[PDB]
């Protein structure tokens, strides 16, 4: 329950969350691949846009992020809106609600155009400001699952581009997708936002890093590449959440 999961999340720590992000999560592997075949500014813009349309997918989120990375590798992208207008109808894994998704990309296009490499650096040092900027450009509540998720994925892309790590702000709540919501119901009747913020504050692990611990495992990622000390902690968590 809450007490035991906060203890184990605390023992895993931001250190353990970062290991999972940078070594286990296939989505980071996909981003690393894309980073080697498109310029850094476009890479970061594309990752934010892709996050904001990563919902009502088909198949598995990890397959979608690999499709995105393999598609944009080596492409000459100008308008991100026009790139998604050509990409999404030809997608295997993102075929529903395409006009809705495209209108979201149209709305954030001006904001994305401000992401020079200098500005990307500044935002990685102040991800709370990025969080509000994305929400305001979209015209939505910042608590929205895809908005907080886009901040997480910005942090994946930015650490690759900038060769530095900054932790996600404690105040950014967990992205409430089907994996997180279904797990939360097994554990509690509390709404996931309050539940995981309490665990975050008790453990010292910000909610977006808690997401990195939980979400790959809930999709079936293997923990067997983790070093023994970490792997033993991940196994205790799996027995809790499974
Ligand atoms: N919580 C969460 N959601 C994800 C991840 N990857 C991904 O594609 N999603 C989708 C699910 C959902 O539609 C959106 C917000 O959670 O992001 C991910 O890593 N974590």
Residue numbers in the entry: -2 to 239
Which text from the study accompanies this structure?
The residues involved in GO-moiety recognition are conserved among the AGOG proteins studied so far, and we confirmed by soaking crystals in crystallization buffer containing 8-oxoguanosine (8-oxodG, Pab-AGOG + 8-oxodG) that the Pab-AGOG binding pocket has the same conformation as the one previously observed for Pae-AGOG. The damaged base is sandwiched between two aromatic residues (F146 and W212) and makes H-bonds with six Pab-AGOG residues (Q24, W62, K149, P172, D174, D208). The sugar moiety of 8-oxodG interacts through its O3’ with the carbonyl group of S51 while the O5’ establishes an intra-residual H-bond with the N2 atom of the base. Unlike Pae-AGOG, Pab-AGOG shows a change of backbone conformation at the catalytic K142 residue upon GO binding. The torsional angle Ψ of K142 has a value of 128.8° in the apo structure and of –42.9° when complexed to GO, leading to a substantial conformational change of the HhH hairpin. This conformational change could be induced and/or stabilized by the presence in the protein active site of sodium citrate coming from the crystallization buffer.
8-Oxoguanine (GO) is a major purine oxidation product in DNA. The major way to remove GO is the base excision repair pathway, usually initiated by a GO-DNA glycosylase. While no enzymes with an A/G specific-DNA glycosylase or a dGOTPase activity have been discovered in these species, a GO-DNA glycosylase called AGOG (for Archaeal GO-DNA Glycosylase) has been initially identified in the hyperthermophilic archaeon Pyrobaculum aerophilum. Despite very low sequence identity, AGOG is structurally similar to eukaryotic and prokaryotic OGG1 and OGG2 GO-DNA glycosylases and, like these two proteins, belongs to the Endo III structural superfamily partly defined by the central helix-hairpin-helix (HhH) element followed by a glycine/proline-rich region and an aspartate (GPD).
